[PDB]
Amino acid sequence: KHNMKAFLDELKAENIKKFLYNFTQIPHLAGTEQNFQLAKQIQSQWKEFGLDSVELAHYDVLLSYPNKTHPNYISIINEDGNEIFNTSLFEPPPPGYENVSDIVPPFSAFSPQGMPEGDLVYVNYARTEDFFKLERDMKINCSGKIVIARYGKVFRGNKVKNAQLAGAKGVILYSDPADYFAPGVKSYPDGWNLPGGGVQRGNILNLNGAGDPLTPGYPANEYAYRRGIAEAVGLPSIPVHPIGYYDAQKLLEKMGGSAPPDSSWRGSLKVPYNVGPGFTGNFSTQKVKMHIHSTNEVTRIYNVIGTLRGAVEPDRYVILGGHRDSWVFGGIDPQSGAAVVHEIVRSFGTLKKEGWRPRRTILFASWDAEEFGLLGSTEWAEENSRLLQERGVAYINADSSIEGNYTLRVDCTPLMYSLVHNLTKELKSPDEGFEGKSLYESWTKKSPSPEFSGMPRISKLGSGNDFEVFFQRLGIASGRARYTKNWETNKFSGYPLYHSVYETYELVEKFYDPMFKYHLTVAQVRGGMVFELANSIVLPFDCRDYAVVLRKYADKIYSISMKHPQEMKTYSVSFDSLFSAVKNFTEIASKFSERLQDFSNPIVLRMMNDQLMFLERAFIDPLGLPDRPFYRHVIYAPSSHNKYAGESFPGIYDALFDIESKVDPSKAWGEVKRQIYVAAFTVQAAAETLSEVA
Template structure:
């Protein structure tokens, strides 16, 4: 009987099981949808993130850096091509590579010194006898500096020319610096020596020319970079400080992207504007020199003493210049002569692109990028970032190749070319794929210099992604601090008080064009971020890591002085990778519109405090702007609530897609291609660059400053116009966040 019951029970169970199986899989509707139903509701997998974090390896990053920095890899040189090959090899590796990787070339306008006629700066006495010649190459401390491919220090896009004149000291070369100097010294025919900082590189020459200055020198003052240290035995290779002969190279143009093809991708047959129509480049020759030589020149200058704020670290008084040298100087009556042989050339520069195809939403892109080109070996700039990127792609690529993981959305990796010449590769990419990228890109993550120093994380971003950065940073251990997260370490170094969140780490804004995020932010309006590890500001005043853009930015330097053990690199890779995975995998995009509202409110409050009173006198009301920001806040609150109260994993996948589209496209609502008539590459009305230097809406701040200075009614009209542009952009953004219909 027991046996029969047992048999009956087993039979019944078997039949039931068959029934369940038929019911679950056998009925068409369910069975055919089951496959994709799982797929479309897939969310970020925390255990996968843990796995990713554990796989990110500091030694791999170190080895990447070693390989990338074997030779100088300035844009379009043989060394650059070598790095192209490294990227392609890695990303096309069948076991650790991406789904697909390729190269994209642009023909771009670059500027080089002539290796056969090196640029020269000399102090010349009567009859042009050289009394002092500025060093042509940086001093060799390691074999790196002896590499014949090290490019002579120069100012890219400085015109060639042979100006000669009495030397003057013009501090940082800002408009007010030249104005002040001109009050004392007749600047016509002079050569001005300036120090880095305060004004853009090219601006130092652009600001000088109207005063009749015929040539400009620029150097890095030890005060600004070396915490005052300047002797050979205190600097690299003895410390991280800049050696006396080190020279910061750089691009001296003002606008980002290829200059001959504005707003068009620089393909071979693209129309190019005449060279004479280029704007924003030095009108007179300019050349960077080391502080060793600057010391010789400045300390011999005659004339009145420059103001205290102009004084640097040299053990002499910085005088304006007589113009020219002191009567007591060996250089007395001498001129400074510049012989600049730079030439411009259209050359092919490559981006290397790689993708991992998304599973559920391949038409949504998370883009992660960094430039590949350096000035010399570029261990920190940019290869620290590239080493990190290669480690990310190794870890993620391996998981993809092993079938362990595929992101919900597509990931695009970009290794940009010719960034050092003015963000060229990334800009041309955004111009070529403008529509596709605008429509589909969820976010752009930029990790250029991954590690400036090993104290703390630093992030600049649209406010809507601060939270995902925080989430990621909380899951990563701070280098060298076992029980402290990157987040907790960061908040200790830099924080602010948020009305919503209390004390949180301070995230900067991407209002400038300092790296390849520029075109993504300002031209495409894509939610972006820039991540790095950086200084303890209580320990150094260095403007940037001291050997920036010099021949000393080498693997040796990076591994000895910036990040021994590569633990900060690892922390950045883990944090940025974590953010990347969350953006790619989350069911609901980790983009928070209420955090955007808080930033708009901050900007509004500042604007009201600064401008409202005087605007009233001109009959310009700020009420519409206030209402717009309030609309935005209320729409953001509403959308947050919809997200919070929806069971999105079980509702139609078109609902979460709809919400994600609202989040993805939020920044696009702030674009207005007509907002800034003088700088069409800036279309984002919240984050455009600004010269007014106020922490508020950039176009409003600039228009206001301009009107206040001119006092003209037509300039106040421009303030009113921009207020309307801004108001409608914010209202328009609010419209996109409310219920879709």
């Protein structure tokens, strides 16, 4: 038989291992020849594996690279203008790779050029609350200063935006051992910790879902009209550069001015973590000078798009996508995901060669330039948005399969919760101590839901990966799953060697997953989801799970507002419409579920499958969220303070955020009430798509 079990049994840990090795021998940076040749290899192999069609879709997008003959670095400069300390020009390469040539040195992609020189201010993680503490409580002014911030907690592009708005003339980002060195484990190559010369690469854009900075709204094809660089979307306005903790210590050790305000501001280096501005008495005449000479350049990128045509509903698409471009070797990010996608395609292709086809079409995607701001997935979705919004059932992401070995981590729409619970109940746990137990059992024990007992935690979707355009812009049900660590306060920081030259095949094979059993478990979860979405007769979406979370999110946003009861009385701020809409959604969803269970009629089936598919699409507002036109989902958006985190009722949340500091409270509370109306209307409108159709 050709059922899910046949699909899952065909997946092999050894094939994932072979593919990971094959994908991680040389760098695959977006826009380079090496990454194009890998695209061509994947296209060939996907054809060999049995897909019906495999094409490259290319776009010409803005990328950013350092200048090979004018390197980026930071100095401490004395009063005479002598540079008395320089940061490193490259990461010491790992054993056996000291002769690879095109390793991009650490840089912050899309930094502008400049040579600012000034006094340092240390800003902890440069979060919104860290800048509030500095400016409002400590009365430290960042205007015209160079800020130094530790990586961790939030997306680095939020740090840079926060620093810009504080008036900084430059930003230095560094990896503190408190966040990137787990106690009792050795540095690479002898363990999985970050060495003091290691550096986290990464883009610092604030695109808000736009994709290529030069072509927001439209694919960057051959005839595209491009904005001038001056009007580009999302580019930072001050220079930025990342460094390791050896270099950081040299910059921080001389810092004077004010003491850190409390211990949550101190990392693990042997320095005071003084906030500054500037250095202590003897060194008060020294400054810090940045030298950034990176260039933005329009460059071709290539997505590989494979199709497996559905036997019954070929005009319904289930998409499995993950990226292929990496900062250097991409041992975990993304090749641990891409190797899993490759084995999934191979398994589906094996069933196809035996005469099986899925009910619905499955599309497989190897995205390019994810690391430069989701550019490949976003441009392709802009080009195909009409097909996707009328035909897209679901998107399953597949970036890194492992970021640890402790338990499963899942973020997805409420519509997929029941599908995930059911699938993980049928899969074996790979975990030591849980042999013979289901993955659901181990995951639930190690990652319990805060709300419901005997249930695992599943988080909200924000941004940070290639599902962003499908879910936040187009309203296609989306999910992602990976194996993760037991390190709660680090859930947005990345594993220690994230975006460093040390993320290699050897890292994975020696320290993360020697038997590739976590990779296999993740392949079964991602592949199993895709199989069910593409083959179930009734789409495996449960609208009642949306009703449950909408009530939770309504209670949550109400409680935030209720911290200001006098203003709610004065401006007559009522959440009654929103609770009414949620109650209506609950009632209608319950009746729809009864009809779904209680209807031979393929028109009623498809009519009902269309109601399930368009339910996610009903939460899209075509006017978008305030000043973020490409974030259109009214229930979820990437947090305005941390792109990696999803926020619920984001329009209301942002209207209430720091509202007590607004200078026209009438206007601020007016905007809260406007966002309550937009949310109540959208919840009711979504509920009405589940009513009887006539």
